[PDB]
Design a protein around this ligand. Sequence first.
Ligand SMILES: O=C(Nc1ccc(-c2nc3ccccc3c(=O)[nH]2)cc1)c1cccs1
Ligand SMILES: [Zn+2]
Length: 208
Amino acid sequence: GTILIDLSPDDKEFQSVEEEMQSTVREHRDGGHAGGIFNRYNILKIQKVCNKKLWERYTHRRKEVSEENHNHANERMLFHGSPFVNAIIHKGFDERHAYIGGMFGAGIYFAENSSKSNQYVYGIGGGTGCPVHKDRSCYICHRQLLFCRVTLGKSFLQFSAMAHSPPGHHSVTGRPSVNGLALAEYVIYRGEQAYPEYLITYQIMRPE
Ligand SMILES: O=C(Nc1ccc(-c2nc3ccccc3c(=O)[nH]2)cc1)c1cccs1
Ligand SMILES: [Zn+2]
């Protein structure tokens, strides 16, 4: 039921999605080990992900959350990197897209920093890198990330350096408490609380 619509680079929607991608790159504490060494991306394609069933599944859960939280879904646009990006766009998020060993327990993780999600494109820790060159810092191979609409509802605040949501909450927020430059990361425990809105195809660029 999924169709992918390509956006033109001339489209305001392509440009605002690209700007979010580029402007939320940061340096990582692993020196580039997991995701590669880069300061920016070469955006090759941005597609809108259109699936009626998956969308209705998302808005149904969004209304439930809203009604449990004074009519406030607390919806964000957040990045997601995964070796399962092609299954996610066809079948939706589900407990197979969960990071079992994540710091906030087994859930589905999203990041404000695109470069954080980039670290998971080839698996946890960057796995063994790109399939072709076995390089976590490959500048040749095409990578994909999702830019997703995510319902956080009442989010449990975790200050720090599938399971259930903490009682009385719909998500967890991981607040960075050491690295002054890191943006927040978020965890949901229900696949229905995220919709994979954009598929972004890109390369990491080698610094000059
Ligand atoms: O690599 C896997 N799953 C997986 C998918 C996404 C992430 C992920 N984790 C994050 C943690 C923090 C911030 C963003 C993310 C993010 O964008 N993605 C982690 C693990 C596997 C499970 C079973 C066989 S392979
Ligand atoms: Zn490669």
